[PDB]
Each structure stands twice: as C-alpha cells, then as structure tokens.
Design goal:
This is part of a larger assembly, with chains A (97 residues), B (60 residues) and C (148 residues). Chain A starts with 6 loop residues before the first helix and ends with a helix. In chain A, 38% of the residues lie in helices and 13% in strands. With 97 residues, chain A is α+β, with helices and mostly antiparallel strands. With 60 residues, chain B is mainly beta. Helices cover 8% and strands 18% of the residues of chain B. Chain B is flat and about 55 Å long. Chain C has one domain. An 8-stranded antiparallel β-barrel of chain C has the order 1-2-3-7-6-5-8-4. The two termini of chain C are 26 Å apart. The chains are: A alpha+beta (97), B mainly beta (60), C mainly beta (148). Chains in contact: A-B, A-C. The interface between A and C is medium-sized, with 22 and 25 residues. The complex binds zinc ion. Chain C: It holds the Pfam family RNA_pol_Rpb8. Chain C: It comes from Sus scrofa.
C-alpha cells in the first residue's frame, strides 16, 4: 500500500563494490544449520552478503568488528584502503543519523 | 591397591561440567573455556568442547 | 507478460516457532491445483493476515507486463504506463538460491526457490515444471491480493 524501504537496503547501498561474505549473528542457534530452514532463517541470524548487497542476516560484532574474516576485513582485502575509509565514514554517519 | 588408584590420579584435570549435550555425537561429557575478558568488542563467551567426537559449538 | 508463477494459496500456520519480530510474521502456505509449499514473511502491521485466508500469488519479472524491462530504480512519477495495480500487497526482491533434491546424477525433479525481499525472505517449493522460469540473481516482483 505505501512505499517502504528496509534497513538492509540502505546498508547494502553503504556496502562498497561487490563484496561477498558469510558471517553469523551472536544469537544464531546451533541446530538451524543441521536441520531444516538452513537457508530460510527463522531468526535472521545468518549474515549473507552477495555481490555487495546484504541479502539476509543481522549485523553485529562478529561481522563488523575487529575479527578475522569480517566484512571490514574482506572490504579492505578486496577494495583497498581508500574505499574502506569511505566505508567506515559512511557507516558511522548514516547509522548515527 | 584399588585405593591407591584414588590416591595418585590427581592433576585436577577435568572440571566435570556434564551439562551441555553435543550436537554431533550427543554426549554431555564436555568442558568449558572462559577467555577474552572485557576489551573493546569481544565479551566473555564460554567455548565448550566435547572430547569424544571433537565437536565445538558456541554458547551464544 | 513476465509472470513466472501464478497460483492461489491457503494460510495454514502463522509463526509456528513463535513470534520473532513485532512487525513481521512468517506464514506457511499450501497451494491447490499445484501442491506448492510456501514460506513467506510479510509486514503484518501494514497488511494483516489471519489463519485460513485465501490469496492469489503472482510472481512477475516486471510490473508493466508489456515486455518492457525494468531499470530497478524508484521512479514514482512515471505511474502512467499501466502497471499491475490490481493487487493490495506488492513486494520487490531478488532470488538468491535455487535448491534441488537430486544428486545431479540423472535429472532434477523438484526445485526450491529462495527470494529475499529486502531482508523479507521467501521459499517456494514444488515441481521443476512451474519453477523453470526462476534464474539465480534475477529481480522479481511479488504480488498478492486477498480473496474472499
Ligand atoms: Zn577444539
């Protein structure tokens, strides 16, 4: 009925280039991957970034923190320091506003 | 001779949790780890290991 | 045309595991005349849905349905060229996963299509004959209208 956007769309606009990354949220159940609903997540606790867009998942420490394999780490290693600096500034400004 | 079994094992090795059931071999004989105190991002999360099948699953 | 899929579904369960989000409820549906399983996430605040509700589901590649390709950009002022506005709930999303029950030894008999509507996820299972039109990383419009 009315045009509504989602926060994942805006953060996908924030994500630079064509970064591909898979992380998990901190509240991810250990039995979701073994059983059904592996790729159709009930709690949205599996972060999947495909072609620079945030398909699904809830971001947290484990994807945007200072840990190996994070979204920031992959962004650095795939795009460079200039684009990662712009990524940092855009995240902070948009989310703080 | 059976009593000197209990006399000289010692080493205080296992903490004897026996609480978390495994997700791979379904065995509760497990031990937990408490590391990465305070700091900027990482909070204390208990890492539990099952010894028989080697499976590790986060407390979450 | 561009209509990849078209059927009428019946709501069977709403949040069977429990409510995980306030404005979004996950509903499971079984179709008729095709026997299609379906899992869909909808904005329950804007569009209320009850148990036993019947709706017509249309999966379309474009809203114009005249063969005109969409640019994927929000152009609200060009509502002129006769878009499909016969449906109450319209969503936009990208299909990201296609699953097959087969082992890729002889052929494929059933397909699962996973579409993400900006984080609102949807899985549609069934036979490959009605799921042939889905191609990974394509952009897909979802249209529903509740039936009385
Ligand atoms: Zn280990």
């Amino acid at each position: 009925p009315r045009p509504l956007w989602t926060g994942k769309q805006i953060f996908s606009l924030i994500i630079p280039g064509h970064i591909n990354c898979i992380r998990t949220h901190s509240t991810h159940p250990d039995d979701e991957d073994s059983g059904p609903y592996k790729h159709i997540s009930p709690g949205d606790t599996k972060v999947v970034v495909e072609n620079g867009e945030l398909i699904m998942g809830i971001l947290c420490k484990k994807s945007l923190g200072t840990s190996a394999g994070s979204l920031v780490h992959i962004s650095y290693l795939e795009m460079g320091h200039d684009i990662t600096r712009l990524f940092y500034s855009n995240i902070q400004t948009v989310i703080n506003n | 001779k059976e009593a000197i079994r209990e006399h000289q094992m010692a080493k205080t090795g296992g903490t004897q949790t026996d609480l978390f059931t495994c997700g791979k071999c379904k065995k509760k004989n497990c031990t937990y780890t408490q590391v990465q105190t305070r700091s900027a991002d990482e909070p204390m999360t208990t890492f539990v290991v099952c010894n028989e099948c080697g499976n590790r699953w986060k407390f979450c | 045309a561009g209509i990849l899929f078209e059927d009428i579904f019946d709501v069977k369960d709403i949040d069977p595991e429990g409510k995980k989000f306030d404005r979004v409820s996950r509903l499971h549906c079984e179709s008729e005349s095709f026997k299609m399983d379906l899992i869909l996430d909808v904005n329950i605040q804007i569009y209320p849905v009850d148990l036993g509700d019947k709706f017509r589901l249309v999966i379309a590649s474009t809203l114009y349905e005249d063969g005109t390709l969409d640019d994927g950009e929000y152009n609200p002022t060009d509502d002129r060229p006769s878009r499909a506005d016969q449906f109450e709930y319209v969503m936009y999303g990208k299909v990201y996963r296609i699953e097959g029950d087969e082992t890729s030894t002889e052929a494929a008999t059933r397909l699962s299509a996973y579409v993400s509507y900006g984080g609102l996820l949807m899985r549609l299972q069934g036979d490959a004959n009605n799921l042939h039109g889905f191609e990974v990383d394509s952009r897909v419009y979802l249209l529903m209208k509740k039936l009385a």
